[PDB]
Design a protein around this ligand. Structure first.
Ligand SMILES: *C(=O)CCCCCCCCCCCCC
Lengths: 208, 40
């Protein structure tokens, strides 16, 4: 239970490209994937400038708490793709002790400024003495698809990382009715250089 | 100008002489764990 507050745990997160080879054949490329460990602490003040400010922004969200809902994920994304049409998707899975109606908000930012927001509402399914929430094959917005295409058409990986220096994603999962922050995940990116593929580090966001 | 301009963002890196984007402190220079820059 890494990316977990007291009320919600994200067990799975992945962004992928699915390509149809023929009517019965599909190829899936994972860009990034997450699937009692000790998570290192990062001072949240070090990342405030990289995320939206003002009311409802990262600082406001963190100050309202709870503090145990706040995480920073560093991805090394696998951009080694290939080439029937294709599908860019995001999937994620959550578990809660509580039966809630949850809202998942994803903001894509450049220089800390919101470029696009995707919003999804999810209802609970009972499973083995708890409740599960699944966002399955959510279509990646056109901005992200364009962003990825533009990244790959850069001559060198150092250029890719230079662009990514100012690209962030903020994920906020909320109880729709109470507006309690269940999970808040800040995402930062580099390109994976390793032949071993996509990698990640997960951190707890702390005040001081 | 627009900070969210996608073309300008990529132009800044492709053609640095014409770069017109906000200037920031690179992650490398911030008070962060070493693991932040060293993958597992
Ligand atoms: C548009 O709908 C925004 C939804 C953003 C979902 C986050 C997907 C994470 C993308 C990671 C790809 C890596 C590119 C460097």
């Amino acid at each position: 239970r890494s990316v977990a507050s007291s009320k919600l745990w994200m067990l799975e997160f992945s962004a992928f490209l699915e390509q149809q080879q023929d009517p019965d054949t599909y190829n899936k490329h994972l860009f990034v994937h997450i699937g009692d460990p000790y998570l290192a602490a990062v001072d949240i003040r070090q990342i405030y400038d990289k995320f939206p400010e003002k009311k409802g922004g990262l600082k406001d969200l963190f100050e309202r708490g709870p503090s145990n809902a706040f995480f920073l994920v560093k991805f090394w994304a696998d951009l080694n793709t290939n080439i029937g049409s294709s599908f860019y998707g995001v999937s994620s899975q959550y578990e809660s002790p509580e039966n809630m109606i949850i809202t998942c908000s994803t903001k894509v930012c450049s220089f800390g400024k919101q470029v696009v927001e995707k919003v999804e509402t999810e209802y609970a399914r009972y499973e083995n003495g708890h409740y599960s929430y699944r966002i399955h094959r959510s279509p990646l917005c056109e901005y992200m698809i364009n962003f990825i295409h533009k990244l790959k058409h850069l001559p060198e990986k150092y250029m890719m990382n230079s662009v990514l220096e100012n690209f962030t994603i903020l994920q906020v999962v909320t109880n729709r009715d109470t507006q309690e922050t269940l999970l808040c995940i800040a995402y930062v990116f580099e390109v994976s250089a390793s032949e071993h593929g996509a990698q990640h580090h997960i951190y707890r966001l702390v005040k001081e | 100008d627009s900070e969210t301009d996608l073309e300008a963002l990529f132009n800044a890196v492709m053609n640095p002489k014409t770069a017109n984007v906000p200037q920031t402190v690179p992650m490398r220079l911030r008070k962060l764990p070493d693991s932040f820059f060293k993958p597992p």
